[PDB]
Symmetry: none
Subunit: 100 residues, 4 copies
């Protein structure tokens, strides 16, 4: 009767509606996937940063070591120079007296 058309359309509509539910589910699926993509990038960026850090510290440490080597080399050469001056000053004193 007239009831049947109504029942029918109701069904038609549940039918139309679930199509929408399916489109939307597909969007939700994309969401999870893009989320996974972004996770992976960030995740890997973190690892890249930790790596630069460890590198930077290794370089820092090494350069400081390198410069510290030079410093003690120079300190040592300074002390030798400074000794030679002390020696010469004395000798020099002695000689000037010897003249007087």
């Amino acid at each position: 009767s007239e009831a049947c058309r109504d029942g029918l359309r109701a069904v038609m509509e549940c039918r139309n509606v679930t199509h929408l539910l399916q489109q939307e589910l597909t969007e939700a699926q994309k969401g999870f996937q893009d989320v996974e993509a972004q996770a992976a990038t960030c995740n890997h960026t973190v690892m890249a940063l930790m790596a630069s850090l460890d590198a930077e510290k290794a370089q820092g440490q090494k350069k400081v070591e390198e410069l510290e080597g030079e410093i003690t080399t120079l300190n040592h050469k300074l002390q030798d120079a400074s000794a030679e001056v002390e020696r010469l000053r004395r000798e020099n004193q002695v000689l000037s007296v010897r003249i007087a």
Copy 2:
């Protein structure tokens, strides 16, 4: 990230959309029910009509029987009258001859 809000909304929508499904499904259920009401009516109207038919036929048959009883009663009373005439015509003939 920005993906999450998208994934979220899509879920929000599948959620909103099924509500609509559920509304529609309730309509569909009403449909089947009202369809059932009309079924019952018609169904019962049929039985009512079959009953009238059987009643009408029973009445018809009985009244015809009733009228047929009267007919054979009359047919019998007719034959009797018709015999009495026959008897009387004869007797009557005899008597008129007896006079002549």
Copy 3:
């Protein structure tokens, strides 16, 4: 992460599940259709029954008419016979007296 797989499945399921919704909606649709068909039958059976009724009544009415006709015909023929007897009885009486 492990969340993503879970999110995913859930979507997979909503996806699987709506398929079932759709099968079921198709069953529903068949329901209303098989039902419209049943309405039509019942509907038409009703009309057929109303027609038999009207026929039956017409026949009943006509046959009763036909028979009441016969009854008054017979009643009329009875009265005639019944008069003829009355006539003959009288004539007969007269004649028998005439002899005595």
Copy 4:
């Protein structure tokens, strides 16, 4: 009829089924949320690491500045000592000749 019970159950089912859809949609929602949380952590860990990097580089750069400064200071003091030796050796030579 028998069709109505079938139409009915199919509706019943779509009804039962969507409930499941709704539960699963909630799981999907939880997924995106457990995920958004993770995004934010990672996201913020990234920033923390970029900061340590910029700090480590600043420190590195400063410490190296601090040190190479010392080296050229020493190099300068060395040259001065080394000049004083040169001066004294000469003066000293002159004096020893002056005696002879």
